[PDB]
Design a protein around this ligand. Structure first.
Ligand SMILES: *Cc1c(COP(=O)(O)O)cnc(C)c1O
Ligand SMILES: [K+]
Length: 437
């Protein structure tokens, strides 16, 4: 701990809550890193194909998706006005072009969890219906909307411990399928989230104290309860694969928009990081899409640097931020995770270029500037990636490490991955806007 600090001087900066940037000196080629992921392009394509089978279902189940034929995807937009504002405010040029991926605006649940969380639920539904002999892979999955199917899914239950987007996404999707669903939340969690889940028929259970203990107790009660599936965001490869679908979806958007990614036109992507499933899965999908020419960076609150700590020390989930005296208290509630994933750090470290932290105030400030400059309103967690471009462009050592020429830097695309905000009510959004400077 001080034993850690002695071996890893960077840990002093973390304990001091200093905004920190760590470039990974151990990245590898895609070919060299792939064996360690434990998943393949075929696994990723099976996820695309599964979401395709569900498209006719989703188009009917969630009519908000009818216009996209039941595909759950988000806009890729250019934010050059925000680019200029960031350059002005932090006095660091951003080379090339700044873009924003609006996972904050995915349909159904308005966050990145509309990828992994929804996918997990649909995969579970499909597996059950297939094993029951009620569905085949060639069926029109619209049939899952029937009263008979709703009865069938009601014979199984799903539970989540989440006060945020994971619970919102899993709850909404599971209730529509017809599972019995329970979301376990602290009593202090925002009313609008509980109202929303309840409006969808989700049972929201609240705990006035010992919430973390409550979730562990729920997870154990489910562990030996055969028809309850308690979501495990620390270990689920299915969540990870659901997120990874973003890689080819993004590649297709770049192609449509006429945007090149190659050795002479690198893509740098900046991904907010909680437990690591979301950014890790997205990063894996990106690497399969773009190979060595995409460079991914994870972004965490200074009060919650669990993945940076885990990868930097090589301890991964064997260490928590609380182990080094950091409080895990942050306005970035989607990122307030004290211990990294059970598998993402080891799976992905060879394929991740860097990890950095930013303070709550920095998130609030940028949140305001983005509303002012681009008219896009996000939750604080979804601004973590927005600091990334200037961390990278400021670092000569990173650039020399990878051998970027000034011309490559000029032709770089910087993509900030926005992860939530679209479903946040006006009141809460106004509160976020009031906190920036
Ligand atoms: C889920 C989430 C993330 C990333 O979370 P992981 O726990 O790493 O999968 C980032 N931003 C928001 C708003 C989220 O809800
Ligand atoms: K984190």
């Amino acid at each position: 701990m001080n034993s850690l600090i002695a071996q890893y001087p960077l840990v002093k900066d973390l304990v001091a809550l200093k905004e920190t940037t760590w470039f990974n000196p151990g990245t590898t080629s895609l070919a060299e890193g792939l064996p360690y992921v434990g998943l393949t392009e075929q696994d990723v394509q099976d996820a695309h194909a599964r979401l395709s089978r569900f498209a006719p279902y989703l188009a009917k189940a969630f009519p908000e998706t009818a216009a996209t034929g039941g595909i759950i995807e988000s806009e890729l937009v250019a934010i050059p006005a925000m680019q200029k504002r960031l350059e002005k405010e932090y006095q660091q040029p951003i080379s090339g072009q700044l873009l924003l991926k609006k996972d904050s605006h995915l349909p159904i649940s308005g966050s990145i969890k509309a990828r992994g969380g929804i996918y997990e639920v649909l995969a579970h539904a499909e597996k059950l219906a297939l094993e029951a002999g009620l569905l085949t892979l060639d069926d029109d999955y619209s049939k899952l909307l029937s009263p008979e199917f709703k009865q069938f899914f009601s014979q199984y239950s799903i539970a989540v411990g989440s006060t945020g987007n994971l619970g919102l996404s899993i709850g909404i999707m599971s209730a529509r399928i017809g599972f019995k669903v329970t979301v376990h939340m602290s009593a202090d969690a925002r009313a609008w989230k509980k109202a929303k889940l309840r409006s969808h028929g989700v049972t929201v259970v609240e705990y006035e104290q010992d919430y973390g203990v409550a979730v562990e107790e729920g997870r154990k009660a489910a562990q030996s309860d055969p028809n309850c599936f308690f979501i495990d965001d620390e270990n689920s490869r299915t969540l990870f694969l659901g997120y990874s679908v973003a890689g080819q979806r993004l590649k297709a958007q770049f192609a449509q928009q006429g945007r090149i990614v190659d050795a002479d036109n690198p893509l740098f992507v900046y991904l907010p990081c909680g437990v690591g499933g979301g950014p890790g899965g997205v990063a894996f999908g990106l690497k399969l899409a773009f190979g060595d020419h995409v460079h991914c960076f994870f972004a965490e609150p200074t009060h919650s640097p669990c993945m940076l700590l885990g990868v930097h020390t090589g301890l991964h989930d064997q260490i928590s931020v609380q182990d080094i005296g950091i409080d895990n208290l942050t306005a970035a509630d989607g990122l307030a995770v004290g211990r990294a994933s059970g598998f993402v750090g080891r799976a992905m470290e060879r394929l991740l270029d860097g990890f950095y932290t930013l303070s709550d105030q920095t998130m609030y400030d940028m949140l305001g500037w983005l509303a002012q400059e681009e008219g896009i309103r996000l939750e604080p967690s979804a601004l973590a990636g927005m600091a990334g471009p200037q961390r990278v462009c400021a670092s000569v050592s990173y650039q020399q490490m990878h051998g970027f020429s000034a011309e490559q830097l000029r032709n770089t695309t910087h993509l900030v991955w926005a992860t939530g905000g679209g479903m946040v009510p006006e009141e809460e959004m106004n509160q976020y806007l009031a906190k920036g400077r």
